[PDB]
Design a protein around this ligand. Structure first.
Ligand SMILES: [Mg+2]
Lengths: 54, 178, 97, 429, 180, 52
RNA sequence: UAAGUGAUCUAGAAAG
């Protein structure tokens, strides 16, 4: 479930090894973003080809 | 109603304090709160938060809490079913990880009570960190939880219990006595 | 709004806009006396942890005294006082190695 | 490719989510954790200092910055406060930007548009202690307790993140319902209200309940912290009440004591499910958006009361962390039971598992329902449910869950029982 | 440059708040200090001495108006808060002057350096911020003195020194101290 | 100091930042005025005598 | 040795 998923993600982030250490300047960057218009800019030919693979 | 007509524990605590019930009834209130906590399916931070708020507020409330605790492990612990008991233990652990002083009064006394104790220990571990927790325990007088004196293989039982729920220092203690 | 804390306006809100100050607030404020325990523990954990100039100063003082004395008693001329002062300085130097 | 493969595992035995066959492999690459959610990707990069510097340099080369306008035009999370939100250090800010740029470069714009206005980059460092991000409607602030000043009493809303090896509650993660979700909720409320000049008060009430239940069951723990959401709830609830009062062409506050709304339908009331009688956290709005915060001065909440404490739906919903922990427990227990049965040679009875019956995720009871064989073939169902939004006019407000695969994740009969009590008992009503 | 630090006498300070030989005499009258110190002294705003050994022989330490200018800057903008210094002595211990002499560098260098030295001295001497205190007068009626007392208690620094009875009237002219 | 909003309306232009259309308040003397309720005439009752 | 004082929106009639 989405909340469950979120929780899992959080756990993972905590459970990454040496993730919170900042002694040697270990900079962790969390990037989040939307893939904008990802549905709106599929070409059908390419899509078809991709499908053919699977 | 107050407990349940309140978003965070903090709010609930505030509401309770508004009432300004006599130093007589504080214990009763605490008991009620505990019961409520037990009733909920699993341990909630809310109740713990409320307790903390109460505890900070006044010495009488602290006293009441202590009394309640005493009542529990002594006379009211064996009555509860397992999940409820576990929840209670967790709550107590939370209370004790920070707010309370580690003061604890613990062969014969081992069914429900032992499991409650185990639960509490687990909670403590979760909150603190194992070695740190151990250190903290050492710092307080603590004769009941970990009796230091060998006392003719009476500590063996305790060691066994500890082993049953992943823990350290027991072995060391055993070594010490021989 | 009272101490920056009340709800800006009673309208809209859809509520009384009443404001009980909390008694958790007090608790939050207070545990530096009662957090305090933690601090104490921390403290416990980390709890265990020129002569030449003086001489010079003394010499200076002595010189000053000498000067004062000179001023007091027959030393309108500079050479005398200066001489005596110099001698004193020399003596001081001798005394300190 | 290689990184992706690593993430997957081997084909013969692939990894579970965010697990790796070794630690060394995990360490090797800069990226650590990935998850796309429904075309909203989440990448956790973990750099060393040297690595970071190079990236920064590259970024600078790409796009010179003499006046220092990288902190300006940078997506930071306004919901959080200025201290706890991502601090704008000339290293950290630059690093995030560089990362974003790199990511952009990696995909052609023609295939998909990865905009800076869409994106967010939190950066954990020596100078930034709050790893922030918005997932699924939650806003999560992961703040390690080693970085935290005084490791205060765990609040409600906060998930204590746990280290799986040592079992230590090693970090905290504070939650807030993301503003978008709040907005959505508001919209829903409006919809409910609008197009309801007729409706049987009761229908409206039911709708409201449904809305409210969806809101609360989705973010149980994460409501408490967000004050805006609370405010909206208060307002929304009031609006709903007034709708009913609009029908009765009055809204005189005495003529509708909470009795008539919250009393269940089984005593003739509307049977609303309030989340409004909460004393909302007020705070120094001077120091709230700015800097740091604490819960002081409660605001009114919703109504004049006759000291009638109407219980609140939240206290009858088990906060998400608790639920997850419970799930972890009882699934293990279930497994153990199964093992025991196997050892003894038996079919595991549903009467023995009673006690942990309505407890877990999925609810234990999802095993022993009398129509399970077919739902095992319904795979890729959650996604389908989610995508329902685009097929249907009025959608499900409980897209996130699904009763058949999960079991009832909430139960609110207790609440019903207690509301009556709160309202004096039956006689009073 | 090496400069020392030590607080002046409280009474002396108070006096200050409210010809070399003459100055020396005055100093003696005030605190009963040594005469050499008095001779060397040359203060502003607080106290600045020139009390090493070799300065009386040396001509580098002689002509110290420019030097004292530098010190003034230090006094203006101290070490702790970049906020002004108060109730402090500054006696020189030794001065690292090179053989090569140029008027542009010698003075300019001293200017920063003196300030730095002062700061160092302050650091050494167990520095402390001094806040001011308002002297207060309140003129309550008779029966509200307890209220006033309570208020005072509630504020951090506070002292009711004396509750002077304003004759022929209800008023209790209460002298006070409260930090600004 | 907590800077109470009591203090805002007392020294508006100071304690409050960006005050607008704010009028200036008064800042007064104390009123020692004693009225006899027991039907007596010119008496130092509530206060105390001079030293000399 | 010191908790617990106060902040309380509303408010109906016509036609459609
Ligand atoms: Mg018409």
């Amino acid at each position: 479930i989405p909340p469950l998923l979120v929780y899992k993600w959080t756990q993972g982030i905590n459970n990454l090894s040496e993730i919170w250490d900042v002694s040697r300047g270990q900079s962790a960057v969390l990037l989040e973003t939307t893939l904008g218009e990802m549905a709106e800019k599929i070409d059908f030919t390419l899509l078809n080809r991709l499908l053919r693979l699977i | 109603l107050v407990l349940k007509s309140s978003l965070s524990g903090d709010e609930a605590a505030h509401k309770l304090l508004k009432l300004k019930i006599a130093n007589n009834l504080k214990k009763s209130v605490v008991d009620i709160i505990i019961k409520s906590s037990l009733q909920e399916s699993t341990f909630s931070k809310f109740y713990s938060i409320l307790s903390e708020r109460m505890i900070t507020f006044h010495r009488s409330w602290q006293t009441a809490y202590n009394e309640t605790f005493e009542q529990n492990y002594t006379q009211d612990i064996e009555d509860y079913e397992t999940d409820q008991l576990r929840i209670l233990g967790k709550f107590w652990g939370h209370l004790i990880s920070y707010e309370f002083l580690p003061m604890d009064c613990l062969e014969e006394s081992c069914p429900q009570g032992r499991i409650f104790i185990k639960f509490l220990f687990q909670e403590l571990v979760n909150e603190l960190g194992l070695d740190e927790l151990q250190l903290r325990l050492n710092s307080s007088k603590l004769d009941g939880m970990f009796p230091l004196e060998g006392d003719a293989e009476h500590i063996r039982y305790s060691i066994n219990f500890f082993t049953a729920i992943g823990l350290g220092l027991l072995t060391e203690d055993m070594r010490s006595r021989l | 709004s009272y101490n920056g804390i009340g709800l800006k306006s009673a309208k809209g809100s859809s509520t009384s806009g009443h404001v009980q100050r909390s008694l958790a607030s007090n608790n939050r404020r207070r545990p530096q006396g009662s957090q305090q325990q933690r601090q104490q523990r921390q403290n416990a954990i980390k709890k265990a942890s020129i002569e030449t100039h003086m001489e010079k100063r003394e010499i200076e003082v002595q010189v000053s005294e000498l000067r004062d004395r000179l001023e007091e008693e027959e030393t309108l001329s500079e050479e005398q006082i200066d001489k005596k002062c110099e001698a004193l300085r020399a003596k001081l130097t001798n005394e300190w190695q | 490719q290689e990184r992706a493969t690593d993430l997957a595992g081997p084909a013969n035995n692939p990894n579970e989510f965010m697990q790796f066959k070794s630690k060394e492999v995990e360490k090797a690459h800069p990226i650590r954790l990935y998850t796309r959610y429904l075309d909203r990707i989440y990448m956790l990069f973990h750099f060393e200092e040297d690595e970071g510097e190079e990236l920064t340099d590259e970024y600078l080369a790409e796009n010179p910055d003499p006046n220092f306008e990288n902190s300006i035009g940078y997506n930071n999370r306004k919901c959080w406060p200025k201290d706890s939100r991502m601090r704008l250090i000339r290293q950290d800010v630059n690093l995030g930007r560089a990362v974003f740029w790199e990511i952009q470069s990696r995909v052609p714009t023609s295939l998909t548009s990865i905009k800076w206005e869409n994106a967010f980059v939190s950066v954990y460092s020596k100078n930034n202690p709050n790893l922030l991000f918005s997932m699924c409607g939650f806003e999560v602030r992961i703040l390690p307790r080693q970085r935290m000043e005084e490791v205060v009493s765990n609040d409600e809303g906060v998930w204590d993140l746990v280290d799986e090896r040592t079992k230590q509650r090693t970090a905290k993660a504070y939650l807030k319902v993301s503003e978008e979700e709040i907005k959505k909720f508001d919209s829903r409320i409006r919809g409910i209200l609008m197009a309801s000049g007729s409706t049987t008060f009761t229908k409206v009430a039911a709708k409201w309940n449904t809305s409210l239940i969806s809101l609360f069951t989705y973010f149980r723990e994460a409501i408490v912290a967000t004050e805006p959401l609370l405010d909206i709830l208060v307002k929304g609830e009031t609006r709903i009440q007034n709708r009913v009062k609009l029908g009765l062409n009055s809204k005189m506050p005495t003529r509708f004591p909470p009795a008539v709304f919250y009393t269940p339908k089984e005593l003739g009331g509307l049977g609303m499910i309030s989340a409004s009688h909460i004393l909302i956290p007020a705070s120094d709005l001077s120091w709230s958006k700015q800097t740091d915060t604490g819960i002081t001065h409660f605001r009114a909440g919703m109504t004049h009361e006759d000291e009638k404490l109407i219980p609140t739906i939240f206290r009858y919903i088990t906060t998400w962390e608790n639920e997850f922990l419970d799930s972890q427990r009882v699934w293990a227990e279930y497994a153990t039971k199964r093992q025991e049965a196997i050892q003894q040679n038996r079919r595991l009875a549903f009467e023995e598992l009673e006690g942990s019956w309505d407890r877990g995720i999925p609810r234990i009871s999802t095993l022993f329902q009398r129509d399970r064989h077919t739902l095992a073939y319904d795979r890729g169902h959650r996604i389908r449910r989610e995508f329902k939004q685009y097929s249907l006019e009025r959608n499900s407000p409980f897209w996130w869950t699904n009763s058949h695969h999960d079991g009832k994740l909430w139960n609110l009969n207790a609440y019903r029982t207690d509301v009556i009590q709160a309202l004096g008992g039956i006689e009073t009503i | 440059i090496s400069v020392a630090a030590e607080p002046m006498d409280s009474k002396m300070i108070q006096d200050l708040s409210r010809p070399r030989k003459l100055s020396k005499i005055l100093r003696t009258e005030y605190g009963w200090d040594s005469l050499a110190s008095r001779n060397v002294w040359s203060f502003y705003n607080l106290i600045n001495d020139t009390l090493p050994d070799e300065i009386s022989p040396e001509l580098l330490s002689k002509y110290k108006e420019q030097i004292i200018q530098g010190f003034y800057w230090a006094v203006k903008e101290g070490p702790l808060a970049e906020e002004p210094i108060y109730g402090v002595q500054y006696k020189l211990l030794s001065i690292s002057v090179p053989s090569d002499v140029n008027i542009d560098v010698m003075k300019s260098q001293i200017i920063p350096l003196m300030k730095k030295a002062c700061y160092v001295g302050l650091l050494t001497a167990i520095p402390i911020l001094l806040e001011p205190i308002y002297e207060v007068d309140i003129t309550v009626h008779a029966p509200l003195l307890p209220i006033v007392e309570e208020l005072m208690k509630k504020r951090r620094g506070s002292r009711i020194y004396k509750t002077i009875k304003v004759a022929g009237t209800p008023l209790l002219e209460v002298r006070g101290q409260v930090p600004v | 100091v907590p800077i109470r909003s009591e203090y805002k309306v007392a020294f508006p232009h100071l304690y409050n930042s960006r005050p607008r259309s704010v009028r200036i308040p008064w800042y007064n003397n104390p009123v020692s005025c004693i009225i006899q309720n027991d039907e007596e005439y010119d008496t130092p009752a509530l206060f105390f005598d001079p030293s000399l």
